[PDB]
Structure 1
Amino acid sequence: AHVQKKNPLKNKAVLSRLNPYAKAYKANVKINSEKTPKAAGEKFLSVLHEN
């Protein structure tokens, strides 16, 4: 048993064996849009742009 070690990051068949979740993963989800509320008050900006 286990004559050869196969890398789950390269062998996709070994990955499905070890992780029964990679089938439904959906890595790149989109959470941003064209209404991004830039959040940096004038107090913080003044401190940052100080001296």
Structure 2
Amino acid sequence: AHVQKKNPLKNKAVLARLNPYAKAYKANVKLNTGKTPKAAGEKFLTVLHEN
């Protein structure tokens, strides 16, 4: 048993043997679908630019 280690990060079949969730894993979800406000603030910017 186990004559040769296979990197799951390269061998996709081995990555399926471990981690059954990989098939359904969804990367790159878009969450900036809204108006995207700006959160800087008046106090923050006057502190930022001192000196």
TM norm structure 1: 0.94
Q: Note the residue ranges of structure 1 that are not aligned, 5 or more in a row.
A: none
Q: Note the residue ranges of structure 2 that are not aligned, 5 or more in a row.
A: none
**Once superposed, what is the RMSD of the aligned Cα atoms?**
0.9
Q: 1 or 2, which has the higher helix percentage?
A: 2
- Identity across aligned pairs (percent)? 90
Equivalenced residue count is 51
Return the offset for 1:33.
2.5
- Alignment partners' CA distance in 2, 1:34 and 1:22: 29
| Structure 1: 4+ residue segments shifted above 6 A | none
- Alignment partners' CA distance in 1, 2:39 and 2:31: 17
Q: Do residues 28 (structure 1) and 28 (structure 2) align?
A: yes
TM norm structure 2: 0.94
Which deviations, in whole Å up to 9, do the C-alpha atoms of 1:1-51 show, x marking residues without a partner?
100000000000000001110000011100003511110101000000111
